[PDB]
Amino acid sequence: GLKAAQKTLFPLRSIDDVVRLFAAELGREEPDLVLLSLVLGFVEHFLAVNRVGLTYFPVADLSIIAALYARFTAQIRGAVDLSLYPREGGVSSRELVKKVSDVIWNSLSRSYFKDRAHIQSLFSFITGTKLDSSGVAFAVVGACQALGLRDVHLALSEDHAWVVFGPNGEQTAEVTWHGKGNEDRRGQTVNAGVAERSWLYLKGSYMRCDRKMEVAFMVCAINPSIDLHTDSLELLQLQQKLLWLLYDLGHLERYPMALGNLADLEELEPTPGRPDPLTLYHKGIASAKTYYRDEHIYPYMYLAGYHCRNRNVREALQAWADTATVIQDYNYCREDEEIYKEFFEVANDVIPNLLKEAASLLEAGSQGSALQDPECFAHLLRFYDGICKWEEGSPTPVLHVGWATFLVQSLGRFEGQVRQKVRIVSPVLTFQSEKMKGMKELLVATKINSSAIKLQLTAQSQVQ
C-alpha cells in the first residue's frame, strides 16, 4: 500500500540510507509510521537480536519490507470495518479507537515476558505477535493512520502512553496496560488520573504528539542492547543520527525525554560540531518549562545523572533538589511507584555513595568539596523537603524509617560548622514541608540527634 515515491530509496544498505528514508518521510505531509517502524524493527532485529551472518548492515530489500507492510495493513483493514463507525467531521469516535485497540490486543501472544527488549516495533508485532506496553499504544496510532484517521495521536507521560483523538484532539482514550498487576482502564479517559494530580498523568501536562513527534518516539524506542554488557554500535549510531535529524527539523522542541536521550548518546560518543551534553540536558529542562509547566521530573533526573557520573557532587545535588521541587506539588498515588523507586534509589543509594566517596576525598585533602559547601547542604535539605511536601495530602505515605537511617548518615557527612551556615527562613533556604520545618533546630547540632530526626521524618509517635 506504499506509494511509488516511498519505494525509491530501497534497498537500504546502510545507516545513512535509513536516515535518508526518515528524512524523506519527514518531508512528507504525513510520515508513514507503519513503514518507518517496520524498517527500524527489521534493522534492530538483525543488529541486536540475531547478528548471525552480519557483515556490515542488514540490507532492507523493498520486497521484504513491502511484504511486512502488507501483512500489517491487511490485518488492520480486514478486522476494522470503518463503515460501522461513521466519522462525523474528519474526527474519529471512541468506539472506533476502542475497536482498533482491541484488534491490536487480541493479536498478541496469550503469554510472554512483557518487559523484554526488542518487542517495541511493528516488526515485533508482525513476526513475533509481541508488543510492550507503549508498543501497543504506538501500534494503535500506526493502525489508525493506516486507516486514514488523521486525528488519532499518541499521548505520553513519563511512565505511560495512550491516545488523543476526536473534535479538536480533545478526547483521551486508554489503549494499553500500565505496569504489572494494575487493572487496565482501556477505552476510558485519563481524566480521573489528571484530577487526582498523580505523577502518572502529569496534572495534564503530558505530551500530545503530532505525527513528527510520533516519529521521534519510535526513534527514542530503538534499543541497541545486545545483552547486559554489550550494545550495538550500529544501532547507537543510527539512533543518534536520527535524533539529530529530528532535532534539526524542530521535532524535539516539545520532547524533553528525547533531548535527554540525545544528550546521553553524545556523552557516550560526541558528534563533532554539536552542542555538549550539558547544553542538551538544559534544553530538555527548558522544553519542560516552556511547554509542560515545568511539571516533568525526568529532565532534572537526566541532568543529575550526568553530574553524578562525572562526580560533579554539587551540581548533582542541585539537580536532585530541583527534581524534588517538581514532585512536591503532586499527590503520590497508586500507579506512581516507578518515580517512588527513582527517588528511593537517589536518597538511599546514590547520594550515600556519592557522599561516602566525597568524605574519603576530603580526608585526602580535597578543596572546594561539596561537603564543605553550605550551598550543597542546602540542596540536600531541599531534596528532602520536596519529598516530604510530596507526601503531604497524598493518599499513600512516602517516608518510612528505611529513609531515616540514610538521612541521618547523609546529614552527618557535613560537619556542624558547615551545617550552621545555612539560614532557614520562614545560603538561604525556605522549607515548604512541615516535616522539614520541625527538623530545623536538629539540622545544626554538632552531634546530630539521630533518634529525634527519625521521629521527625516518620512522624513516629512513640519510642521503646
Helix, strand, or coil here: 30?
coil
Residue 14 falls in which region: left (phi positive, over 0), alpha (psi -120 to 50) or beta: beta
172 binds ligand 5A1 (CB under 6 A): no
CB 172 within 8 A of CB 133: no
Rounded CA-CA distance 138/130 in Å is 13
The amino acid that residue 15 corresponds to is: I
Of 22-30, 87-95, 150-158, 453-461, which part binds ligand 5A1 (CB under 6 A)? 150-158
Q: Interface with ligand 5A1 includes 302 (CB under 6 A)?
A: yes
Q: Which listed residue (118, 153, 160, 251) binds ligand 5A1 by CB under 6 A?
A: 160
Q: Quick one: which of 340, 309, 348, 335 has its CA closest to 323?
A: 340
Q: Does 65 bind ligand 5A1 (CB under 6 A)?
A: no
Listed in sequence order, the residues at least 6 apart from 254 whose beta carbon sits closer than 8 Å to its beta carbon are 207, 213, 287, 291
Q: In the complex with ligand 5A1, which residue's Cβ is closer, 307 or 435?
A: 307
- Least Cβ distance, residue 415 to ligand 5A1 (angstroms): 32
Closer of 265 and 399 to ligand 5A1 (Cβ): 265
Closest CA to 33 of 72, 61, 60, 62: 72
Closest approach, Cβ 217 to ligand 5A1, in A, equals 6
Stated as kind and residue range, the H or E segment containing 246 is: helix 233-249
With contact defined as beta carbons under 8 Å apart, do 216 and 175 qualify?
Answer: no
Location of C-alpha cell 530538555? 284
Q: Minimum distance from CB of 216 to ligand 5A1 (Å)?
A: 8
Q: Which C-beta is closer to ligand 5A1: that of 21 or that of 257?
A: 257
- In whole angstroms, what is the distance from residue 76 CA to residue 307 CA? 46
Verify binding: residue 155, ligand 5A1, rule CB under 6 A.
no
Return the exposure string of 95-116: e unless at least 16 CB atoms fall within 10 Å of the residue's CB, then b.
ebbbbbbbbbbebbeeeeebee
Asked if residue 156 binds ligand 5A1 (CB under 6 A), the reply is yes
**Contact pattern from residue 117 through residue 136 relative to ligand 5A1, giving x for each residue in contact according to CB under 6 A and a dash for the rest:** -----------------x--
Does position 158 interact with ligand 5A1 (CB under 6 A)? The reply is: yes
CA-based radius of gyration for the chain: 25
Q: How far is the CB of 410 from ligand 5A1 (least distance, A)?
A: 20
305 binds ligand 5A1 (CB under 6 A): yes
CB atoms inside a 10 Å sphere around CB 55 = 7
Cell numbers that stand for 137 in this block: 499504544
Q: State the nearest-atom distance from the C-beta of 95 to ligand 5A1, in Å.
A: 24
Q: Which is nearer to ligand 5A1, 258 or 370 (CB)?
A: 258
- Would you say 138 or 165 has its CB closer to ligand 5A1? 138
Which of the residues 321 through 360 are near ligand 5A1 (CB under 6 A)? none
Output b/e per residue, 390-416; b: 16+ Cβ within 10 A: bbeebeeebbeeebbeebbbbbebbee
261 is a site residue for ligand 5A1 (CB under 6 A): yes
10-18, 159-167, 184-192, 387-395 -> range binding ligand 5A1 (CB under 6 A): 159-167
Cα of 372 vs its chain's centroid, Å: 34
Count residues near ligand 5A1 (CB under 6 A). Answer: 16
Residues 6+ apart with CB under 8 A from 163: 97, 137, 140, 141, 144, 152, 153, 154, 155, 172, 173, 175
Please give the helix or strand (H or E) that residue 207 lies within, else none: strand 207-208
Kindly tell me which of 39 and 156 has the beta carbon lying closer to ligand 5A1.
156
Task: Give me the phi and psi of 367, to 5 degrees please.
Answer: -110, 150
Which C-beta is closer to ligand 5A1: that of 342 or that of 392?
A: 342
Q: Interaction with ligand 5A1 in 369-428: which residues (CB under 6 A)? A: none
Residue 168 grid cell: 479538536
Interface with ligand 5A1 includes 240 (CB under 6 A)? no
- Judged by CB, which is closer to ligand 5A1: 261, or 318? 261
Residue numbers 194-223 binding ligand 5A1 by CB under 6 A: 217, 220
177 lies in the site for ligand 5A1, by CB under 6 A = no
Interactions with ligand 5A1, residue window 282-301 (CB under 6 A): 298, 301
User: Least separation, in Å, of the C-beta of 298 and ligand 5A1?
Assistant: 4
Q: How far is the CB of 258 from ligand 5A1 (least distance, A)?
A: 6
List contacts with ligand 5A1 (CB under 6 A).
134, 156-161, 217, 220, 257-258, 261, 298, 301-302, 305
